[PDB]
Amino acid sequence: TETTSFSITKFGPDQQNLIFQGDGYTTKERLTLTKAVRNTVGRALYSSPIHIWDSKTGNVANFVTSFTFVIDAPNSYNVADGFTFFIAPVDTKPQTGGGYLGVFNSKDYDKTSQTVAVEFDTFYNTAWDPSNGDRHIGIDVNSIKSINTKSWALQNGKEANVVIAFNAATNVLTVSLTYPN
C-alpha cells in the first residue's frame, strides 16, 4: 500500500515542497499563479511523485484533493483564461498559454500528453468551448476540449471551495465547487 498526503493551510514565502513554473510564486500566504497581467502562465507542482496506479497488479489509487481559490478580475466581464488542477507525467513542463491553460496544446486528442485536468474556465474560446458561451467547470483528458462540462457563475473576488475525488472501484472522478452563501 502506498499513500502520499500533505496539507498547506497558508503558503509561506519559501515553500520548498512545491516546484514553481512560469510566474507561480507565493505572496502574503497565498499561492499566486498569475497576477492580473496579460499573456502569462504560472504553474505550481507538489514536489513528490505520486504513485497513481500499478502495472503489476493493475490497481489504481483512490485520491481526494480540496483547495480554496480566488479569481480576481478587473470587472465581471473581461476575465480570462482560468485555472486547472492537473495530473501529468513527473517531468511535466508548461504547454501553450491563453485558452490552453498552460496544460494542453490542442483541441485534438494528443496521446503524448498523458495529462488529465479539471479546468475552471472563465473565457469562451469559440473553437472548443461549449457553444452557450458560459464559464464552466470541465474534465479534460489529453485535449483542451473537455469531455464533459457544467456551467458555473463566477463570483469575482470570492473564495470558492472545491473538492475533486477519484474512486478507483468505479473510475468516477467527481468535482464539487461551492461558493459559501
Binding site: 499561492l31 492580473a36 499573456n39 480566488v70 476575465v79 485558452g99 472563465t122
Partner: peptide
C-alpha cells in the same frame, strides 16, 4: 505522476490564487 495547478491569461486577464491545498 506529478500533480499541481496551472493558470493562464491571454488578451484578457485576472489574478488566480490558491489559499489552501490538501491531497
Amino acid at each position: 505522476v506529478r500533480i499541481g495547478f496551472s493558470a493562464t491569461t491571454g488578451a484578457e486577464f485576472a489574478a488566480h490564487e490558491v489559499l489552501s491545498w490538501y491531497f
